Amino acid sequence: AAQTNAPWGLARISSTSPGTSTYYYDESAGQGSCVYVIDTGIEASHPEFEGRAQMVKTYYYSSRDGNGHGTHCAGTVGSRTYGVAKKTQLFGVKVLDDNGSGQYSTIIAGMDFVASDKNNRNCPKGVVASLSLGGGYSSSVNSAAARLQSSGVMVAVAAGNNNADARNYSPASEPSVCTVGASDRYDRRSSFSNYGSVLDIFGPGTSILSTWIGGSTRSISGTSMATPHVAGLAAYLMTLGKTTAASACRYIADTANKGDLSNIPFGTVNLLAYNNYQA
Numbered sequence: 001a002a003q004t005n006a007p008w009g010l011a012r013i014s015s016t017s018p019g020t021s022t023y024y025y026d027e028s029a030g031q032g033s034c035v036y037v038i039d040t041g042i043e044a045s046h047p048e049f050e051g052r053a054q055m056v057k058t059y060y061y062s063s064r065d066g067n068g069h070g071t072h073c074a075g076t077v078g079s080r081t082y083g084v085a086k087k088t089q090l091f092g093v094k095v096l097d098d099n100g101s102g103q104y105s106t107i108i109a110g111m112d113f114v115a116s117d118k119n120n121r122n123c124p125k126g127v128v129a130s131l132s133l134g135g136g137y138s139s140s141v142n143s144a145a146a147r148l149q150s151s152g153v154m155v156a157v158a159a160g161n162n163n164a165d166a167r168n169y170s171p172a173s174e175p176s177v178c179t180v181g182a183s184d185r186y187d188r189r190s191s192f193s194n195y196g197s198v199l200d201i202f203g204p205g206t207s208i209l210s211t212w213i214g215g216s217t218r219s220i221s222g223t224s225m226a227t228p229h230v231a232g233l234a235a236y237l238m239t240l241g242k243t244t245a246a247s248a249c250r251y252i253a254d255t256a257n258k259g260d261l262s263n264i265p266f267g268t269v270n271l272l273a274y275n276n277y278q279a
């Protein structure tokens with residue numbers, strides 16, 4: 001299947017070169033997979049989700065996304081127009097308040113919620129978790145992501161937007177998950193993107209157009225935007241049966257666009273998420 005004039009990020013993960021505007025993907029499009037968007041929540045009523053998104057858990061007074069970050073990242077995972085896996089089921093876990101902040105204990109609780117709740121859902125193709133959040137190093141935040149990963153969930157986390165080494169940030173520094181750095185439309189490392197050896201993959205992170213609260217859309221930047229690309233990519237490939245949750249990050253790096261990014265500091269992987277689709 002081919003989506004013309006797709007957001008540059010979708011077209012980039014379906015191409016070996018930058019500058020295309022068509023997102024090519026297998027029409028299964030993540031059908032049968034589930035992605036938990038652990039963020040500010042998801043406006044599940046947005047027409048772009050077509051009934052495939054729903055709130056499953058909040059840690060605040062409402063499950064409503066008052067921020068828009070979670071709806072944006074959910075839209076990048078699998079909204080109709082802005083999503084990588086356009087047929088996937090989106091579950092929203094609101095661990096961050098309407099200002100975008102959250103306690104580590106709340107974020108650890110949300111990760112442990114996904115590890116259990118996936119046993120009550122119907123995800124025959126696999127379970128994915130998109131963690132578009134980051135803070136300083138925390139051995140407990142790292143451990144919760146490792147437990148999420150070990151329980152059988154493809155965990156994708158943002159490398160962080162500090163232009164620093166990601167080893168000082170959690171859950172980015174947890175090696176068992178999929179730490180995702182950010183790139184722009186000219187295949188440069190995003191100027192904000194964290195780097196380091198703990199990084200596993202890069203995705204489109206600068207000026208990512210996706211859903212927003214109020215039934216709207218907007219473009220924003222961050223490794224928090226590159227993470228749902230890889231989370232949606234993992235969901236998309238798990239549905240195709242090419243990978244599993246334990247092996248998806250390793251598989252995505254093996255099939256990535258190698259050496260195509262500039263400004264990648266020495267020691268940091270030069271790998272761009274790539275769906276490897278051949279129409």
Ligand SMILES: [Ca+2]
Nearest residue numbers: 016017257260
């Ligand atoms: Ca290339």
Ligand SMILES: [Ca+2]
Nearest residue numbers: 175176177200
């Ligand atoms: Ca890793």
